[PDB]
Write a protein that binds this ligand. Sequence first.
Ligand SMILES: Nc1ncnc2c1ncn2[C@@H]1O[C@H](COP(=O)(O)OP(=O)(O)O)[C@@H](O)[C@H]1O
Ligand SMILES: Nc1ncnc2c1ncn2[C@@H]1O[C@H](COP(=O)(O)OP(=O)(O)O)[C@@H](O)[C@H]1O
Ligand SMILES: [Ca+2]
Lengths: 341, 283, 173, 203, 397, 167, 134
Amino acid sequence: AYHSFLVEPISCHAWNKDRTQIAICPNNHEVHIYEKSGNKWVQVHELKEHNGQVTGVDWAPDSNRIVTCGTDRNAYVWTLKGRTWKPTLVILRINRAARCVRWAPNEKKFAVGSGSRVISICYFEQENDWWVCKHIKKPIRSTVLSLDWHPNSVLLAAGSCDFKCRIFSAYIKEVEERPAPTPWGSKMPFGELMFESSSSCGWVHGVCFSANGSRVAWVSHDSTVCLADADKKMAVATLASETLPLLAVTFITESSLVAAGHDCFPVLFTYDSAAGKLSFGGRLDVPAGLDSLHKNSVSQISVLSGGKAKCSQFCTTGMDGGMSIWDVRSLESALKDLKIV
Amino acid sequence: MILLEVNNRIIEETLALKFENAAAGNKPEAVEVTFADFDGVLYHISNPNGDKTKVMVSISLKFYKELQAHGADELLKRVYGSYLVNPESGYNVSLLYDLENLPASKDSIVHQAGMLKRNCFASVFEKYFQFQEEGKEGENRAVIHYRDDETMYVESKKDRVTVVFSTVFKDDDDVVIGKVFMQEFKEGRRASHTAPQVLFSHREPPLELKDTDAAVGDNIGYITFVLFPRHTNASARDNTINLIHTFRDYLHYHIKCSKAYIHTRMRAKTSDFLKVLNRARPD
Amino acid sequence: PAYHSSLMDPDTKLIGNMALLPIRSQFKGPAPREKDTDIVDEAIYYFKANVFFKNYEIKNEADRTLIYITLYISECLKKLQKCNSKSQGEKEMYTLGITNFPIPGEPGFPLNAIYAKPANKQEDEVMRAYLQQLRQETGLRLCEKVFDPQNDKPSKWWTCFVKRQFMNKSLSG
Amino acid sequence: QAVLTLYAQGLLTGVVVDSGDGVTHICPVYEGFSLPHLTRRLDIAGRDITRYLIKLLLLRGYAFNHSADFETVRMIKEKLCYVGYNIEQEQKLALETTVLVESYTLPDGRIIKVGGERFEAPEALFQPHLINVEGVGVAELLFNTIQAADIDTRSEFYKHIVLSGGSTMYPGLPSRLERELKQLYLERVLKGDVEKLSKFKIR
Amino acid sequence: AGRLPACVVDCGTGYTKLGYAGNTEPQFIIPSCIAIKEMKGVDDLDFFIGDEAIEKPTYATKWPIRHGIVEDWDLMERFMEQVIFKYLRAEPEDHYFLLTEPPLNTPENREYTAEIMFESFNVPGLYIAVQAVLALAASWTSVGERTLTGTVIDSGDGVTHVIPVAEGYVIGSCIKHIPIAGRDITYFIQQLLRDREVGIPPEQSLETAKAVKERYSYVCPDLVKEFNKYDTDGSKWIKQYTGINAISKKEFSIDVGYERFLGPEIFFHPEFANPDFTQPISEVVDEVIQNCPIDVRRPLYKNIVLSGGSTMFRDFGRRLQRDLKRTVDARLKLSEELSKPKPIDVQVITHHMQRYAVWFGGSMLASTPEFYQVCHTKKDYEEIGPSICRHNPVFGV
Amino acid sequence: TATLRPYLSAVRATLQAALCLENFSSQVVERHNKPEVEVRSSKELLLQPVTISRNEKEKVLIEGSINSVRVSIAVKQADEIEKILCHKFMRFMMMRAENFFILRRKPVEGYDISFLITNFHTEQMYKHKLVDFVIHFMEEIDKEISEMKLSVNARARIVAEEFLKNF
Amino acid sequence: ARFRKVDVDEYDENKFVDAGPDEGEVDSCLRQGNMTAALQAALKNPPINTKSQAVKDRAGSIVLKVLISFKANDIEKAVQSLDKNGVDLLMKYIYKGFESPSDSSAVLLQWHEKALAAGGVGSIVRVLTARKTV
Ligand SMILES: Nc1ncnc2c1ncn2[C@@H]1O[C@H](COP(=O)(O)OP(=O)(O)O)[C@@H](O)[C@H]1O
Ligand SMILES: Nc1ncnc2c1ncn2[C@@H]1O[C@H](COP(=O)(O)OP(=O)(O)O)[C@@H](O)[C@H]1O
Ligand SMILES: [Ca+2]
């Protein structure tokens, strides 16, 4: 189920709670929000404020607020005022481009990875009425490429160009409280380094936490996918792909990973908790001169309905400017060899 | 155009226009012209002393003394007779034409004026062609520095006369292309066995010139034409002369035209490449 | 630019918005009496020049009369062209001048956006009468010029304008 | 100007680098107001850069008129120009690759192409002599100001350098200064490498 | 300056003027055309240029230069081969070259030209002069104080250009074009002659027009008055012209009249021949100068120079100056009558070398010491690259 | 050939692996975007240089980075005439490098011609086709160089005879 | 114009900072004609962490020496007896081999072919992304 919003890349996307509208950045300083009308897409909003390309967009469901970050180093939280979106500036206190951003589940703070080699955890103080932020610096040595929050809204996973997937703690007591002990550790003060991959290869293009967040997976440039299990002393299972690097990854269950990247199509990975072994059971895009829906690298992939616990539909945007919607069950019927989890 | 022409169009056209207006009885327009020819030749056409009823065509060659020392003067006299006059300061030979005293047919004189350059060269070849004929061997060789850094050597033997050109290729790549041409000249007889034999030394001069101050350098090249009696006799002489004296320019004229052609090939190839490269866009 | 009339006076009479200028002519018409230079003269003088122009700025109501005479000259030439004697064409002219050419207001008259329409039956009558008088005098004078003192010879120096159309307009189109 | 500037900038004691469309200043400001005695000026700013671009674009094959096309060239500068960080590095990009080349449609429709002159024009700010001017350039100039100041109040100034003015909007400008300053401090204050502690930021 | 004069080649859209520097007239004025067989062996060399390539039977005639710019490099390059080795008979490695380019020629084009001149012909030096500037320089022949600031009115057969120059550099952003030139005039004179004369062979309708246009046409001060004279004393104004029928050789003969003045007239009254354009040429020139910087406007009015074949017409400058003054004078009037600005000095220079003003200025400039100074050399080309030919220092004042 | 197809095949595969780029803002300069393989000022962003050699003369260098790839080719030049024809040909194209967008103005020292393909290129164009273009390019320059070589010999023989036949 | 000659970036505290096979074992396997074993022997304990080039180059040659010693139709069989980790390291050595042509290219290109079929283009990507490589 493919739709082309344009022939240039979709830098990133974000959906509202009802999956009624989607935010996209088309290689632009802008953010276009489309809404569905029957079976057509209609542009309804245009968020112009960034003076640089938007590299990350996240939509907080309940509070219905949009957060964006660009190469101009800024980050505006967008609030809906009747018929318009108003941006509120948020000083990230960085000197390089912001590369990514994600609201926390509790919607009380959002994180921004950047080329300043730090992650900016932002939150609001209803006291002095504005957005502040603390930095998680050490031991980050390069640009942070991707973020994902743990369900408890405190732990944070990060993949950066220093070939590492790490889990920190963005505990901001000014807006929440003593995180409940996790298999990832009891002590969780701010910025504490909870976990860190060991391979010194491939930029970590994308990282993702499981539904309960006791498992974390990430895809690197060395064409490999990994999943570290917190119920197994953080053991890490790796599967070296025979094809090009994956740029995005997400759990569709507690043992099924779906990813896409430079090969231009989604694939399925399954985790065998017992043997602690990842397996490839993928390629869901089964049928310019390409036999795949997207005609350029797929750079993002989000869960559309069913959570990461039992995903039913998932979205993929890519450098071709296309947006695809994939139905998990639908796929299970078109391919008999399919095995979720 | 493959072979280079011999006559000089500016000389002939200029003269003609003056000769026409002359016949038509019109009043003479003043004329003052400066121009060149291949190999450092400079000409001048003007009204001597401002007398617009006279037209002088002078030629200047930095190496005239050399040709003078081999019959130049005598030959020019035969060819131009009363048109030949005292040379204009700065030039070696001057032709004068009285606009009020032209022949019935002007084609002979116009054609001959256009061949001034060639006739200045003619004598040196005739002199040595005549040596071969009389079997007069052992005669010293003529050394003509037609260019500042290029030399022609003429010599006669028992049954053959040799012309050797010491040419220079400024552009290091022109040497390489020249080689392709010279190769074809050496084998030129495989299609004409009676034609002159051609030799080429990348750049050690022929042995006959090792003790001479002959040039020796990566960009230098020696060409040797072996002319036989059938080419040097009173029946072939003129034509043979018309070709031989234009060789060095012929060679270089074709090295440049080749590059021009390689260029049209590169335009086409690059043009294709750009299309393929752009069909690479989602349109 | 184009040539304009200089016969407009402070006390010149108007028929519609055309200037009712004097005219040395025998033919009858509401034409006033006249200086040995009438508007029909001024038009015949400027024709060969004016005719080429495509744009013409109306300055006086006198211009409108000048424009009219001009357009008509083209009509005459379209006639004198196929004649074989000043005597003959001299007729085809009297005739032509009598024909009922359309007038301001009617469909067929080019320039109904520059030429006022007769405000009533009286004006309509006068105007019609004037235009006709004008056509007749004009066609007559034109005949002396058009034909060389060698009859049966419509001067190609007048015939050659037959296809030219002042301001790209025609009283016959 | 710099008073109110660095002032209600929510900081009240740092240094203001102010370059608009005509003149550049370096305004030190200590707890409260400023100290005129140190404040220096640079006779190189807005117009000068725009001026210089014109000259550069001429040599490229585009003959713009100094009066007639000034506004046109000013618009180009604003849009395509920027401050190179490592000039040696930038010149190589301009000479070996075409990634710096950009197109610009002129008011009459013609489309010119600007490349290396994008970072050369604003480079005047650092090398005045390029536009026939005597001086050490905005960076070196700044460094001398602060150094030639109450050592106690120095550390403060460095950690409080603020940019103001159109000609300071140039992409990379901040980074360039910092690198330049780190080069002068390394040479004219030390020689040995103990820079990790030489902190200072321009925001 | 060595002992050999530089080569000066001016490539116009219709004609190419060539010769050596210092000469007063070009040594060859030939058609900017090449005939080819329409590659292997030496097929590329099998062509002819200029006149010799207009009637070639087994050959197809091409025109490399369109609207002053080079449309076909493969062909322009070959064209040069013969220009150098057949006509000029110049050893290209021994002569510096001065070529010309229309205003608005791109910097790329110069590199393309330079690639040919250096990489194909091996010239020791090269200089690309912009035509308009050369024209200004040619007028110094008339003016005792040489200046390179002025307004150039270039008109050939295509389109006419009003090009303002300031201190040697064309003010590109202010050029303006006029849809009237040699062609529009011929096609017009052609129609004048069709409505009137007979005997003119259809296949020689234009042949006749262009002829009459060049042998008799001129600019007059007043149309009616002119028309008058002609109709009054047709004996002292109606000229005869006789052309030979291609077929039967029947020497036809026509009478030439009005077109003698109605032709050049379309310049001032465009609407005569052109429906889509009406501005009088004196207006365009006025409009142009008005857009150039104020501080340069008067100098431009004071030095309007001509170049082109369509500027040959007798009294062209005289009629242009009158017309322009009337416009500029009348403008300074509404100010005195609204509030007295110093009167503007409008001048239009016409000289003898106009038939080839450009090639002439190039010939004079290329024979001066400075020419060698501001010329790009083969050594700089090979070391710095063709980029250097993008800019050509102005010199001469 | 016998060895051609294999060589290209290896080169194509390495190109497919290398042209996996994305937009990457600078970590070194505020608001700057640069091809890392060129500026090389952040070593973790550069990939391992690699070569695919057909023999000791013909080889290809492939330098990758998070946002760009530099591809340098060593063209086959059997003798002097091919050496100069090739050199003139690459120069011809480099001089028009702005029309090529993936062509490098100068070759990497040691090579005859080079490409600089950035993330902007792989976004504007189908990367699988850019990979095709480079292979298409290598194969086609050899043909052109031969064609030129023949052209020159072809005319040289006609030029020689046209002059010798007239004596 | 002097202070700029120094690359301050060198000492910026934000800059990125990141024995060999058994010859006799390999030679022993080669000399006995057991090629598919010499492969496995050479693809062992690669100098992945050595700071010396000599040491790595030593190993590279040992492996190249085996690759060359192979016969056209004998490669595929050999490659298919390796695990993906094996094929990856192989591919890494084949690229090393491309930097020493010799008489080796013609055959190394056959190795690339076979290695690519087994390890896929991913085995090549991993050659590029390696920070510690042979
Ligand atoms: N984005 C930009 N990048 C570089 N220069 C700019 C930019 N925007 C404006 N400028 C330049 O900054 C100068 C204007 O600064 P400004 O402070 O507004 O002028 P002034 O203070 O003198 O009134 C001009 O040279 C303008 O071209
Ligand atoms: N004496 C002249 N009077 C009027 N027009 C002329 C005269 N001589 C030549 N022409 C016209 O000059 C025009 C030149 O057009 P073109 O072919 O472009 O030549 P060029 O490139 O030199 O301008 C032609 O219309 C030609 O008829
Ligand atoms: Ca011209």
